Amino acid sequence: MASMERFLSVYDEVQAFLLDQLQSKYEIDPNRARYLRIMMDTTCLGGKYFRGMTVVNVAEGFLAVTQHDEATKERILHDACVGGWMIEFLQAHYLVEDDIMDGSVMRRGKPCWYRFPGVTTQCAINDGIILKSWTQIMAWHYFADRPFLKDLLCLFQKVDYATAVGQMYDVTSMCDSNKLDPEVAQPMTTDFAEFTPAIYKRIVKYKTTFYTYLLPLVMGLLVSEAAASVEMNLVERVAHLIGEYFQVQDDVMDCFTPPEQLGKVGTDIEDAKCSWLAVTFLGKANAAQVAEFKANYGEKDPAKVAVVKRLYSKANLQADFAAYEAEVVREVESLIEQLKVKSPTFAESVAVVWEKTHKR
Amino acid sequence: MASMERFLSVYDEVQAFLLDQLQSKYEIDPNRARYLRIMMDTTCLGGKYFRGMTVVNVAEGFLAVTQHDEATKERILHDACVGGWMIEFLQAHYLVEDDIMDGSVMRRGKPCWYRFPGVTTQCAINDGIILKSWTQIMAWHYFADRPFLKDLLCLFQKVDYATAVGQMYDVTSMCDSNKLDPEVAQPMTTDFAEFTPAIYKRIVKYKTTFYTYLLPLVMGLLVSEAAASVEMNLVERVAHLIGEYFQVQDDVMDCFTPPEQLGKVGTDIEDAKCSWLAVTFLGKANAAQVAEFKANYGEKDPAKVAVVKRLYSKANLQADFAAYEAEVVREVESLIEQLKVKSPTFAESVAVVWEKTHKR
Ligand SMILES: O=C1CN(C(=O)C2CCCC2)CCN1
Ligand SMILES: O=C1CN(C(=O)C2CCCC2)CCN1
Ligand SMILES: [Zn+2]
Ligand SMILES: [Zn+2]
Ligand SMILES: [Zn+2]
Ligand SMILES: [Zn+2]
């Protein structure tokens, strides 16, 4: 069985389980079941399944070098699939709630979930809660007797909290820390003093890397009973790196990829986001460039956004991106090498993760 | 040590733990820590702590009849407190997100969290996510080596999902099931055919009773290692009953308690809620009363709301409430008696729960 086709099959099985259970134990009626079925498919399907598929890929890696009965190979692949879906549904939770929080319009060239006419914000916030609750229902059901149940639940729990903390860093990244105050409406920064590499890095680490890279890799290890083939500090460091890199790409695209091909109109400029472009631009601007940036950043007005785009264009950020790229390629090879020591196989899995990131 | 004073002390300890950990492991800065501290206090403190205190009360009950070292008594009380806070913070999650979902204005005579000037919806949806994540951080920290860890986490997980399912029933309770459709904007019901006792009962069971009555009682049992003193089907049935009754009270108050003393302007009429008043009114109206109700229900216009209030006034719903009240008092005494058999002590704890509900 090919990996993707196994993964998608397990979706159908997990969906049927969750919906059947709503009927038999939660007194749901057909039409509400259909609503939740459509919600699940619209929010969970349609991307590349990179995160879910990484758990499958890590487990397939260990399968090739570990002696197992066939039924045991099958159980581990099924566990890897269910695990991947947990991460997919965790992401779906985050995307639904984030889209509502940020007033987004589109995602994947389709409307955000809350903007569907029969959904609305009132239902969508709760739908996003259900998506995450489903991750736990899956885990307690499929993994109830598994030796890795507690470690998986505990990891999932930490990643989720880290992500929510990351979200908070992200949404507050245009404020001056010393002005945060629930009693007082928050002005956008005027000095941009908090637009630094280290601050940028902290947003991306919490907001993205833990759920996008750390979780899928470590879940792979957990379902394979293989956490002893690795140095968990290395896995963290390599995930950090690749994750930060992933975000730098998506920050460049928010600004420069055509809307049709992005799946979204980008608004990082107008939301006054601590993007890599803004940080890197401020790291090399002269005084007159900094005043012009400040006059035009974080304003809805299209003329002012066109000015920020102009400033980045003439800043030769491509040179900074190539230099950043070169250093990440450098460091990730070092970490892959250090991971070769204990696990050739895991290190290959991280290699493949790195490749699928380094392209798109 | 008095119970409340123990419970509130444990708040301070859990808050310090969660905030200290954000600093030492999540790279948080002081001002974001202060924001989350204010968020925690504004969303978690200020009510009666009925749910949290029930876990403490159930555990104190078993303490009086079970032989333990003093340090063991202390650990169980501390576990009961932490457990109660988990339920409190779960509720705080639900209240923050619900207030946003329903466009609420006030709660407890203070503004809803999302309406604080320095918060906004963008942050508040994520703050509510953090509140629930905190429940898990608490459990894995304080209960890491406890024999009841898995059963507590698994119960908490089910209650939370049930609640979210309940929320969905509640928000969709003015729609015709056969018209639910994410593609199509949802019209309010015209026939009110789904405003029945059984449908009402289903909303309340999922939305309220599991988290308000079931969870605190069973958590009490879990931290006391006492789940074998009870017939879990009885605990469920008694919780169902008392919980349904609790909601009937709050449905009567939404309509009739002065706003100042309620802590809220009631909007159940204008939100076209499946309240007990509406269901019970439709259960005894004549044809002309039903047409007038239908002309005026679920409309913001104050004149039309005053008309629905008038209809309930002249319907003699007090007689239906006294009859419902009498039957609940009846059935709960039966269940308390059936619970006396295995646990005199638990049954007393359910008695006290019943009393604090039956008044206010
Ligand atoms: O730098 C860090 C690392 N931490 C972890 O790895 C937790 C979160 C994700 C899995 C366990 C704590 C947060 N900050
Ligand atoms: O009628 C029911 C009963 N159920 C439970 O008791 C689950 C949820 C709360 C604790 C376990 C399943 C849902 N419906
Ligand atoms: Zn966002
Ligand atoms: Zn982006
Ligand atoms: Zn509500
Ligand atoms: Zn109410």
Side-chain angles (χ1 to χ4, degrees):
Chain A
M1 204 169 180
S3 290
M4 182 57 73
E5 107 203 14
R6 189 186 292 272
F7 193 61
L8 299 175
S9 282
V10 173
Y11 180 80
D12 287 346
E13 167 192 8
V14 165
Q15 176 175 89
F17 170 67
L18 290 175
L19 298 173
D20 300 357
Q21 175 178 257
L22 280 158
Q23 184 206 77
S24 64
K25 305 192 198 315
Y26 292 84
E27 298 170 53
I28 207 166
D29 50 278
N31 287 289
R32 283 187 182 79
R34 183 175 43 80
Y35 178 100
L36 290 171
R37 182 173 62 65
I38 293 162
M39 187 271 287
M40 200 190 293
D41 300 345
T42 308
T43 62
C44 293
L45 305 167
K48 289 180 271 96
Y49 310 116
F50 162 85
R51 300 157 187 77
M53 286 299 300
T54 295
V55 188
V56 176
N57 292 330
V58 163
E60 299 192 307
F62 283 102
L63 289 178
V65 304
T66 310
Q67 298 188 309
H68 290 300
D69 283 346
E70 183 67 24
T72 296
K73 293 176 220 273
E74 287 293 312
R75 182 205 85 210
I76 291 170
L77 291 173
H78 193 278
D79 287 352
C81 292
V82 169
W85 285 116
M86 290 177 65
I87 305 182
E88 292 293 324
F89 274 53
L90 180 64
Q91 177 175 51
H93 162 85
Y94 281 117
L95 294 186
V96 167
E97 301 296 358
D98 195 50
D99 285 345
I100 296 166
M101 284 168 223
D102 301 338
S104 304
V105 177
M106 300 299 177
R107 151 176 324 273
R108 283 199 230 88
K110 292 175 61 172
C112 303
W113 180 245
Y114 78 101
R115 299 186 55 256
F116 279 53
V119 176
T120 91
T121 292
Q122 178 176 53
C123 287
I125 294 178
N126 195 64
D127 295 340
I129 291 174
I130 288 177
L131 289 158
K132 190 159 69 195
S133 311
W134 280 336
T135 60
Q136 307 301 286
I137 293 301
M138 288 174 221
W140 288 92
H141 178 76
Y142 293 94
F143 305 150
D145 79 8
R146 296 290 196 269
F148 58 75
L149 189 56
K150 299 191 277 214
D151 285 342
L152 197 156
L153 289 167
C154 185
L155 177 68
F156 197 93
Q157 191 278 120
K158 284 162 163 155
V159 168
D160 173 44
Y161 181 53
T163 303
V165 174
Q167 184 69 2
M168 189 222 201
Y169 292 153
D170 197 44
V171 307
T172 58
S173 69
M174 74 303 297
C175 299
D176 292 342
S177 300
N178 60 294
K179 296 288 214 67
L180 297 164
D181 187 355
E183 297 295 326
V184 174
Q186 292 294 301
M188 173 169 49
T189 188
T190 51
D191 61 25
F192 293 86
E194 293 183 72
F195 276 43
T196 66
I199 295 173
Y200 182 72
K201 284 155 154 209
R202 178 198 62 174
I203 291 149
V204 170
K205 163 190 190 188
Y206 292 98
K207 113 145 166 304
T208 305
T209 69
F210 286 124
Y211 97 85
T212 298
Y213 291 96
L214 186 60
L215 191 54
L217 294 170
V218 185
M219 207 176 277
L221 295 164
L222 287 181
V223 304
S224 300
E225 287 283 328
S229 314
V230 318
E231 189 70 65
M232 198 59 72
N233 288 342
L234 286 181
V235 176
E236 281 195 55
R237 290 159 46 204
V238 84
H240 180 99
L241 219 15
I242 297 164
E244 184 197 332
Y245 191 83
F246 169 85
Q247 191 67 58
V248 168
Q249 289 171 297
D250 205 350
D251 280 5
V252 165
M253 291 190 272
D254 193 276
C255 188
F256 294 115
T257 312
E260 64 203 24
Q261 191 218 302
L262 191 60
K264 195 27 165 135
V265 170
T267 59
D268 282 358
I269 307 213
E270 304 103 294
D271 306 333
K273 299 315 287 271
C274 185
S275 76
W276 179 83
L277 296 160
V279 165
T280 306
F281 177 82
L282 294 165
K284 79 191 277 206
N286 63 35
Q289 279 143 8
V290 170
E292 185 171 357
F293 176 87
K294 287 176 181 181
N296 302 295
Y297 207 69
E299 281 255 2
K300 312 294 282 167
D301 167 5
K304 288 183 176 162
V305 175
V307 158
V308 174
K309 300 225 181 171
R310 214 74 45 91
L311 285 170
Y312 293 170
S313 311
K314 303 171 183 156
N316 189 216
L317 296 187
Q318 297 107 294
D320 306 78
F321 182 80
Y324 167 79
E325 189 191 7
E327 181 54 23
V328 170
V329 169
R330 192 169 152 82
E331 292 181 299
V332 163
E333 296 158 315
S334 186
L335 290 158
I336 289 173
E337 294 298 293
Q338 296 266 31
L339 291 169
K340 280 171 193 212
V341 169
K342 291 184 166 173
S343 190
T345 307
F346 187 65
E348 175 56 32
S349 284
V350 175
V352 172
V353 166
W354 175 240
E355 282 155 304
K356 293 148 69 158
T357 304
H358 194 195
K359 41 156 259 87
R360 74 217 181 78
Chain B
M1 204 169 180
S3 290
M4 182 57 73
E5 107 203 14
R6 189 186 292 272
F7 193 61
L8 299 175
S9 282
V10 173
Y11 180 80
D12 287 346
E13 167 192 8
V14 165
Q15 176 175 89
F17 170 67
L18 290 175
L19 298 173
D20 300 357
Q21 175 178 257
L22 280 158
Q23 184 206 77
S24 64
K25 305 192 198 315
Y26 292 84
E27 298 170 53
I28 207 166
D29 50 278
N31 287 289
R32 283 187 182 79
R34 183 175 43 80
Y35 178 100
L36 290 171
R37 182 173 62 65
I38 293 162
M39 187 271 287
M40 200 190 293
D41 300 345
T42 308
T43 62
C44 293
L45 305 167
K48 289 180 271 96
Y49 310 116
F50 162 85
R51 300 157 187 77
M53 286 299 300
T54 295
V55 188
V56 176
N57 292 330
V58 163
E60 299 192 307
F62 283 102
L63 289 178
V65 304
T66 310
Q67 298 188 309
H68 290 300
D69 283 346
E70 183 67 24
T72 296
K73 293 175 220 273
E74 287 293 312
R75 182 205 85 210
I76 291 170
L77 291 173
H78 193 278
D79 287 352
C81 292
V82 169
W85 285 116
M86 290 177 65
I87 305 182
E88 292 293 324
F89 274 53
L90 180 64
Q91 177 175 51
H93 162 85
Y94 281 117
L95 294 186
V96 167
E97 301 296 358
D98 195 50
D99 285 345
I100 296 166
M101 284 168 223
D102 301 338
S104 304
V105 177
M106 300 299 177
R107 151 176 324 273
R108 283 200 230 88
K110 292 175 61 172
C112 303
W113 180 245
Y114 78 101
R115 299 186 55 256
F116 279 53
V119 176
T120 91
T121 292
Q122 178 176 53
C123 287
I125 294 178
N126 195 64
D127 295 340
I129 291 174
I130 288 177
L131 289 158
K132 190 159 69 195
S133 311
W134 280 336
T135 60
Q136 307 301 286
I137 293 301
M138 288 174 221
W140 288 92
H141 178 76
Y142 293 94
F143 305 150
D145 79 8
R146 296 290 196 269
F148 58 75
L149 189 56
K150 299 191 277 214
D151 285 342
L152 197 156
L153 289 167
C154 185
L155 177 68
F156 197 93
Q157 191 278 120
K158 284 162 163 155
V159 168
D160 173 44
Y161 181 53
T163 303
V165 174
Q167 184 69 2
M168 189 222 201
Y169 292 153
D170 197 44
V171 307
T172 58
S173 69
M174 74 303 297
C175 299
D176 292 342
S177 300
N178 60 294
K179 296 288 214 67
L180 297 164
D181 187 355
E183 297 295 326
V184 174
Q186 292 294 301
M188 173 169 49
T189 188
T190 51
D191 61 25
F192 293 86
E194 293 183 72
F195 276 43
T196 66
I199 295 173
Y200 182 72
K201 284 155 154 209
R202 178 198 62 174
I203 291 149
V204 170
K205 163 190 190 188
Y206 292 98
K207 113 145 166 304
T208 305
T209 69
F210 285 124
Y211 97 85
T212 298
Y213 291 96
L214 186 60
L215 191 54
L217 294 170
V218 185
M219 207 176 277
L221 295 164
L222 287 181
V223 304
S224 300
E225 287 283 328
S229 314
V230 318
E231 189 70 65
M232 198 59 72
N233 288 342
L234 286 181
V235 176
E236 281 195 55
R237 290 159 46 204
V238 84
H240 180 99
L241 219 15
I242 297 164
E244 184 197 332
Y245 191 83
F246 169 85
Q247 191 67 58
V248 168
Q249 289 171 297
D250 205 350
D251 280 5
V252 165
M253 291 190 272
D254 193 276
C255 188
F256 294 115
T257 312
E260 64 203 24
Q261 191 218 302
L262 191 60
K264 195 27 165 135
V265 170
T267 59
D268 282 358
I269 307 213
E270 304 103 294
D271 306 333
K273 299 315 287 271
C274 185
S275 76
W276 179 83
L277 296 160
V279 165
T280 306
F281 177 82
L282 294 165
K284 79 191 277 206
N286 63 35
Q289 279 143 8
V290 170
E292 185 171 357
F293 176 87
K294 287 176 181 181
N296 302 295
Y297 207 69
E299 281 255 2
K300 312 294 282 167
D301 167 5
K304 288 182 176 162
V305 175
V307 158
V308 174
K309 300 225 181 171
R310 214 74 45 91
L311 285 170
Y312 293 170
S313 311
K314 303 171 183 156
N316 189 216
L317 296 187
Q318 297 107 294
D320 306 78
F321 182 80
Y324 167 79
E325 189 191 7
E327 181 54 23
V328 170
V329 169
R330 192 169 152 82
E331 292 181 299
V332 163
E333 296 159 315
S334 186
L335 290 158
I336 289 173
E337 294 298 293
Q338 296 266 31
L339 291 169
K340 280 171 193 212
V341 169
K342 291 184 166 173
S343 190
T345 307
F346 187 65
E348 175 56 32
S349 284
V350 175
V352 172
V353 166
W354 175 240
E355 282 155 304
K356 293 148 69 158
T357 304
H358 194 195
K359 41 156 259 87
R360 74 217 181 78

